[PDB]
Amino acid sequence: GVRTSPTGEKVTHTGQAYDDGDYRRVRFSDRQKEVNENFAIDLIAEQPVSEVGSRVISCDGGGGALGHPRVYINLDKETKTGTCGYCGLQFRQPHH
Amino acid sequence: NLTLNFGPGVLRLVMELSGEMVRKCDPHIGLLHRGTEKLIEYKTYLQALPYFDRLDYVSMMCNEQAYSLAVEKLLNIQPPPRAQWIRVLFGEITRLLNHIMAVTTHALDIGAMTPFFWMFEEREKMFEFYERVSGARMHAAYIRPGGVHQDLPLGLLDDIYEFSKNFSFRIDELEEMLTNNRIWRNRTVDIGVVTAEDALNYGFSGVMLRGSGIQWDLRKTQPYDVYDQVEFDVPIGSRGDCYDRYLCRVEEMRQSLRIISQCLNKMPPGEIKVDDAKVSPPKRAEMKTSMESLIHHFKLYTEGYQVPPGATYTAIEAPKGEFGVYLVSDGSSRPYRCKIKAPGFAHLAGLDKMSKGHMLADVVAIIGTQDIVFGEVDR
Amino acid sequence: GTSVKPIFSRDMNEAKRRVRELYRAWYREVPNTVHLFQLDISVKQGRDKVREMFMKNAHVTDPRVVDLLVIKGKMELEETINVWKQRTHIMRFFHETEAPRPTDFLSKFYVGHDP
Amino acid sequence: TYKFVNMREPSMDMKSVTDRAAQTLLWTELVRGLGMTLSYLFREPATINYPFEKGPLSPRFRGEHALRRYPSGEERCIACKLCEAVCPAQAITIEAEPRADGSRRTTRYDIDMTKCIYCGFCQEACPVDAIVEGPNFEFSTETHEELLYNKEKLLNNGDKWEAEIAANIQADYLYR
Amino acid sequence: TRPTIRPRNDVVHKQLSAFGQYVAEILPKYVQQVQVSCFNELEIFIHPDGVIPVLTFLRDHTNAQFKSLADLTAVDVPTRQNRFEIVYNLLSLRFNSRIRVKTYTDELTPIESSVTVYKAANWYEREIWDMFGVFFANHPDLRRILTDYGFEGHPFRKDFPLSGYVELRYDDEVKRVVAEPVELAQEFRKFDLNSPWEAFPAYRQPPE
Amino acid sequence: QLIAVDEKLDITTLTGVPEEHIKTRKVRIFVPARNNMQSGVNNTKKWKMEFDTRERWENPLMG
Amino acid sequence: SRGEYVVAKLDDLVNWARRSSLWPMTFGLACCAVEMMHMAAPRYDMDRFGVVFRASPRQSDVMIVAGTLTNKMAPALRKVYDQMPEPRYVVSMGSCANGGGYYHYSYSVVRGCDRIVPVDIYVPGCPPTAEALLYGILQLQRKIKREKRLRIWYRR
Amino acid sequence: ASKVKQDMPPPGGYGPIDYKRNLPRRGLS
Amino acid sequence: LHHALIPHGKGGRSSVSGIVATVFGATGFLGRYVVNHLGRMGSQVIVPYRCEPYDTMHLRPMGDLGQIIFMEWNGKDKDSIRKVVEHSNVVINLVGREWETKNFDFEDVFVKIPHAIAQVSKEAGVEKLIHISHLNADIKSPSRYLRSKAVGEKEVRAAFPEATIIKPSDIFGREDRFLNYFASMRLGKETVKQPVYIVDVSKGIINAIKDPDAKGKTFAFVGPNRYLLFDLVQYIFAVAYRPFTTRDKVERVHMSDMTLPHLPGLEDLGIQATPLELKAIEVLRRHRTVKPAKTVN
Amino acid sequence: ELVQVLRRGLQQVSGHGGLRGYLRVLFRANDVRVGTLVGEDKYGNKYYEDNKQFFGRHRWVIYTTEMNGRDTFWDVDGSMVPPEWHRWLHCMTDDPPTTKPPTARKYIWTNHKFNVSGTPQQYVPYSTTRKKIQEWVPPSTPYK
C-alpha cells in the first residue's frame, strides 16, 4: 500500500519522506527513488485467522527447517487472537 | 656503479649495479601493508578467520588450516576424522594450485608464457572444486577452528577423482616445455645458489631448504592432521640453485597427486565439525527445534567462544614454506595478539644475499624461485 | 638512584652534540632537497621548517628521549637523501591543504563543541 | 622417505657423448618443444562464448544480497541483529522499532557492498533465513553510491530473485 | 576424554621439562623462569642482557643446536612497567623440537640485536622497530619496513587508534596526494562482547 | 653503565600523537559498573582507561 | 541537415574503434589480480574481445585497480594515472579498491581508489569472479558506445 | 526409515591414478 | 535554518557545512578550483554540464560520497535552470567563453544566460547569488566582451538586487590563458596589467559565500603588484628559460587594467594576495626543456 | 573425412533458417552452432543445449532483440536472463524451468529488469529512518 507525499514523493513502508524544505531531494532529480511496493503490514493483514481447537498451538512458519524457530502460542484470551512473534500469522480458538 | 629504482604483486627494488653485475639489492616492502594483525584484535576468532584467506592468497585453505590448528590447540579440542581427511585433501589441492601458479608465473617472467594458460585451465577446474564446496571460488572460508563448515556435496569426490587422473599428463606437458629446454636450463641452472648452513641461518623453509639438500618437511617430521597415515616422498635437490627448486616443485605436484589419490580412497564417514555446541554451531534444524541449540547459536554468532588464556606457535608446511601463527589469548572471545610468520618474509630477506654477483636479469629469476606473494610478506 | 640504561649518551651534553650534528646535516641537505625534488618552496622556507621541527621538541629533558628523537630524525634524513620519499611526503610538512584552525575562544565557540 | 631430483650422472661412453653432441648441434629438444606446441594448436580451445555461455556455478554460490519474506508476504527479518554482530567487515547497519501492529521489524537495513567481503556469515547467522546472499554476480555499477544498499534495494532484490533463491535453498539446506 | 578432546602426550611433556631443567642449570645468570604448557610448548623467560648469550647457546650446543629462527615478534601489554614482550621462536632440526625465549623491555631501553646469531632476525627486528618502537642496538640497518615514509607513530601499540590519525586523498589545487586528519563517514562500531560469568575456573585470580 | 638520571617519564614526543590530542583530551580511569540487566560480576574486575566523548554527527548520505 | 548526420556517423565510427580495442594495464596489488589473470585464462579469454593482455602504461586505454590501495601506494597510482594517454578509463575491482572493504578501518589503507583517481566502473566482489570482471569490462564498452563527443562539439 | 547418505568413495575405491613422470624417448642415435 | 542544513563536523571531507551550491560553468578553469574548495570542506555541490560526462570526470574525487551531483542543462531553456537551482541556497555563476561560436555570442553568454539564471534563482528562493564579471567591464568599452559584461552585470543586479558581483582582474594559474598564452608565442611598453592568482579568487568566492554582509557589495579582485606588459612578458620568457584569440583577445590584452579604489578587494575578505613571483615558477616549470620584473606603484 | 566436416558446415548453415539467419547469429553471437531448443522466454530469449559439447559450452542463450525498453540487437548483457533460466543456464540444476516451474508468490516480480546503472532508473541511496530530534515550534501570537 504505497502512498504519496504532498510534494509527490512515494512514502516507504517505514514512513520516510523528505519534507518540503529539505535539499536532499536534489539526489532524486533526473533519477528515481527506490521504493518497495509490497508493504508487509498490508500483506500480513490480508491473511485469514486460523481456527484450532486447542489451548496451545505451535507455529514454525511453514516449511519445517526452512521456516523460523518453533514457538507455542496460548489461545486462552478470547478478546483477541494469538499472533506468532516471528511469522505474524494469527490463531484463535473456535469461539461460539 | 649506479643506483636504479625499479618501482611499481607490487614491489619496489633499489639496486647498486657495476656494469651488469648486481652489487647491492635492497627490496622496499610495505606497499601492501593493510594492518591485518591489528585489525584481527578487534574481531572474534570466527570473525578473524577470513583474514587468513587474504594473507597468502594463492594457497587459501592452507592458511585457514594453520589458523584452525592454532585455535584448536588453544581450545583443547580435536576435529572429527572426516574433517581432518577433508582438510588434508583440500590442502593438497591447494598445494597443486599454488605450485601451478608459482611455476607458470616463473616461466612467464622468464618468457615462456604458454604453460601459464595450459595450467590455468586446470586452476579454473580446481576453483570450481572450491566453489562447489563453499560457494566461493578462492576465499572459501571453509576450514574453521572446529573442523569444516559444510559437508561435501554428493558428487564432489567423483569429480575430484576425474580431474586428478589426467593431471599427470598436464605436468608432463609442462615438463616437456620446460625441463630439458636449454634456454630454461641456462636461465635457471647455477643461479641463486644457497648453501645449507646459509639457508638454515637465514630462516629459509620449504623448498628453499630442500633445494640445498636439507632433508626437512613438516608433513613428515611433525604431522598435524592425517599426514602420518598417508605415504608420499619428499623431493630433495642437490645444488641449491633455481633448477633444483623447479624440479622439487614439479615432483611436489606429483606427490600431491599421490596424496590426493590416497585421500580420495580413504575418506571415512561421520560428521564434519566437533560435536561441541559451545565451539561449533549446531545444525539449523536443531537450532530451530531445541532451546539449547538456539541459545548456543545466538551466543556463538554474537559473542563467539571464549578461548582459554595462553600463547601458542603453530606451524604448517604450506606450499611456500613453514607458515606459522603466534596466537595469544587472554581468555575472552577476541584474540589478544596474532602474529603471522610467512616464509615469503624470510625469503625476500635472503634475496639480497642470493643475488650476489649475478646479472640484472637474474634478479627476476631469483624472485620467481623464492615464490614471493606480497600479501603474506607485508600483511 | 633511578638508574637507567644508556642508548647513545651518558648525559645531556652529548645529546646536545648529537642534536647539533643532526641540525648541521639537515641544514646542509635543505638546498639539495629543494632542488632535486622540484619543490616550489624557497630554501629559506625549508630551513625555517627544519628550525620549527627542531623547536617542537625543545622542552625535552631526558637524554634517552633526546637521542631517540635524534635517531628518528636521522632515519628521516636518510629517507630524504636516498630519494625514498616523493614530493608528496616532503610537501606534507607544510599542511598547505588544511584550513587554519582558530585559537580564540569565540571562534571555537561558533564552529562547534570541540574545545 | 625422500627422492633425488637432480642426482643423475651422464654416461661418458662414445655413443652417449655423440648423442649429447648431436642434441647440442641439431637442437633436438628445441624441435621436441616445437612439436609439443604444434600438437597443442590442433586441439579444441577451452574458451566459452560469454555472455551467451556461462561458467558453471553451485547452489552454494555467494552473490548479491537479498531480504526474503514468507509465503504470506511478510518479511522474514525480525531485527535480531545477529548478521550485524557477526559481520567481519561491519558492512551491515540496522535500526528497528515496533511496527504499527507491534511487530518487531527493521526501519533501517543497510549493507555497504563496498565493505562486504561476501563471506556468507550473515546468511548462516540468520535464524529465519531472511538475509541471503543470492546467485546474482553481474551487478557492476557506474558510481560508488549505487553500491550502498538500503532496505528498499535489498527487498527489491529479494522479490526479483526469489524464485531462484528459494530453489537454491531447497537444493542446499539439508547440508546445513 | 572422549573423541571431542585433544589427546595428551606425557612423554614429550617430560622431555621438554627435562630440557628446561638442563637449560636452566647451564645458564643461571640470565634465565628467570621456565614453563611447559599443557599442549607441550616450552618457553624460557630470561633477562634482557642474556639475549645474545642465551640465543648463542641454544644454537651452538651439541644438545640444543636450535639452528633455525622461525619467528621473532613483540607483544604490547600496557599494564606492565616493561611494556613490550619480545618473543623468539626457535626450531631444531636435529632433535625435531621447538623452543620459545621471552624477554621484556620498555620504550627507552634498547635490546641487543641478534643479527649476529641469526641472519633471519634482521628484517624481523626492523619490523618490531617499525611496529612498536623497540630499539635494537648494533643493528646493521634499522629503519621502517612496513609503514609509509614519514609515518609518525607505531601502529601496533595498544594505545594507537585503529584508523590512525591521518588519511590520504588527492588534491587538485596542489595537484598531488595530501594527508589530512582522519574523518570517517561511518565511525567504527565498538562492541562490548565480553560477558560476566567467567568461563574457565582454572585461571581464576586471587581476590587480593 | 647506568645514567641514574632523575626525571618523570614523558614519551609524548615519541608516540607521534598530534599536539591537540594530548593537551585537549581528558581520560577517565575507572572500574566499569556492573550491568544491571545481569547479576554476573566478571566484567568489574579490571581497570579501564577511556577518553572523553567528542561530537558524532549524521552522514548526509545513508544517515 | 547533413551536418549532424556526418558528425553522428563519424562519432559512431570513433566510438566503435575506441571500444573495440581496449588495452588495459592492471595494478595487481592484491588477490583480485588472480581473478584478473583468470579472465585472461583460456576459459574467458579477454583477448578475444580485443582486450590485450598486459599492455604498457604508455599505450594503455583503461586502468584496472585490482587490490588494496595502501597509503604507501597511492602516489604511485596517481603518477601512473597521470602518464596515461587520453581517453583514459579507470575500473575499480573488488571491495578493497571500491571502498576499502575488509581493511576499511585501517590506518594504512586508502578508503577507496576513487579518493585518488576518478572511476568509471565499479566491479563488486571479494573477489569478483573472472566472469563478473568480464561483465564489468563489457559494461564499460557499452558506456563508451553511449558517449557522443562530436555532437557535443558541433552544438557548442 | 532412511539411512545415512553422504559423499563417500564407491565400494572397492577408485581406480589407480598415474603420477609418475612420463617423458618417452622418441628414439634416434 | 532547516536542521538538515546545520553545519556539523570539523570542516573536513565528510563534514557538513550547510552550503548547497550550484556552480554554473564548473568545468572551466575557475570552476574546478571553486568546486574543489567547496567539496574539501563538506558542502554539497550541484554541477550542470552541457559537455560530455567524460570531461567532468576530474571533479568526481573533489567531494565525498553523494556530495557532488551532476545534472545536464542548457542556457536557452529555463526549466533546466529551475530544476538545477531548485534546492540550492547558493548559486555561483562562472559561465563564460572568451570567443564567439555559431550558437552563442557574447550577448548570449554574458547577458541572457546570467539574467535568466538570476531570475530563476530569485523565483526559486535561492538565498545567495554570486556573479563573475570583469574588472575592465564598462558599457563604453570598444571590446564586445567587456561591453557585454557591463550589460549583463547591470541586468543581473536588476534581477537579483542582493546579488554579489565579483570582478576578477586577469586571473592567472596552472590552467590559465594568460601565462600559457604568452609562453606559447615562442607590442608593449604602454600597457599595465594587474594579474590575480586563481587560488585567491577561489578563496574570495568562498569567503563571499561565508560573509553575510557582502550581500549587495561589488568586489574587485586584484593582485599585489602592477606590471608593464613588456617586462612582464620578459619575466615570463625568462622563467621558461626561453630566448626573448582572433581579434578580441589582442584588443583586450593591449587594454590597460582599470583602477577602482572605491570597490572593496580581497583584503576586505581576509586574503593576502599572492605575488606572481612565487607562482610563476609553478605555472611555467612545464614550458622549460630569478630577476623579477620591476613593478610600478 | 574432410567432406564430412564440409557437409556439417552446410547443415549448420541450413539449420539457422537460411543464409539470413546464419549471418544474423554469426554477427550477433559470434557463433553459428545449432542445438536443440530447450525453451522460450517471455522477454524473447531462446535457450539451446547440445550434450556433445564439453562442459560450459553445452548450454547457451540467444538474447532477445528488444527487452523492456531498449533495442537489444547489439547491446546484450548477462543480466537479461530471468532468475529461473539464470539457474538453468549457470548449471546450478539439470531441470529447466519448463519441466518444473518455480513456486509462484504474489510478491515475486512479474517483469525481470536488467542492470539499470547509468540510466534514470538507477538506484539512489537514501536514509529510511525518520527525524530523531524534534524542534520547538514558536507560537504565532505576539507576547507584548
Ligand SMILES: CCCCCCCCCCCCCCCCC[C@@H](O)O[C@H](CO[C@H](O)CCCCCCCCCCCCCCC)COP(=O)(O)OCC[N+](C)(C)C
Ligand atoms: C576507405 C577510406 C578510409 C578512410 C579512413 C577510415 C578507416 C576505414 C573505415 C572502415 C571501418 C570499418 C567499420 C565497420 C564497423 C561495423 C562493426 C559492426 O559489427 O558493429 C555493429 C554495430 O556497431 C555500430 O552500431 C556501427 C558503427 C560503425 C560505423 C558507423 C558509420 C561510419 C561510416 C563513416 C565513414 C566515413 C570515413 C571518413 C573519415 C576519414 C555491432 O558491433 P558492436 O555492437 O560494437 O559489438 C557487439 C558484440 N556483440 C554483438 C557480440 C554483442
Ligand SMILES: NC(=O)C1=CN([C@@H]2O[C@H](COP(=O)(O)OP(=O)(O)OC[C@H]3O[C@@H](n4cnc5c(N)ncnc54)[C@H](OP(=O)(O)O)[C@@H]3O)[C@@H](O)[C@H]2O)C=CC1
Ligand atoms: N581570464 C580569466 O580567467 C578570468 C575570467 N573572467 C570570468 O570568469 C568566468 C569563468 O572563468 P574561466 O574559468 O576562465 O572560463 P572557462 O573558459 O575556463 O570556462 C567557461 C565555463 O563556462 C561554461 N560555459 C561557457 N559557455 C557556455 C555556454 N554557452 N553554455 C553553457 N556553459 C558554458 C563552460 O562549460 P563548457 O566547457 O562545457 O563549455 C565552462 O563551465 C567567465 O564567465 C569569465 O567571464 C573573470 C576575469 C578573468
Ligand code: SF4
Ligand atoms: S536479517 Fe536475519 S539475522 Fe539479520 S537482523 Fe534480520 S532476522 Fe536478524
Ligand code: SF4
Ligand atoms: S557476506 Fe560477510 S561481509 Fe558481507 S554482509 Fe554478510 S557477514 Fe558481512
Ligand code: SF4
Ligand atoms: S578485494 Fe577481496 S578478494 Fe580482492 S584482495 Fe581484497 S579481500 Fe581479497
Ligand SMILES: [Zn+2]
Ligand atoms: Zn509463525
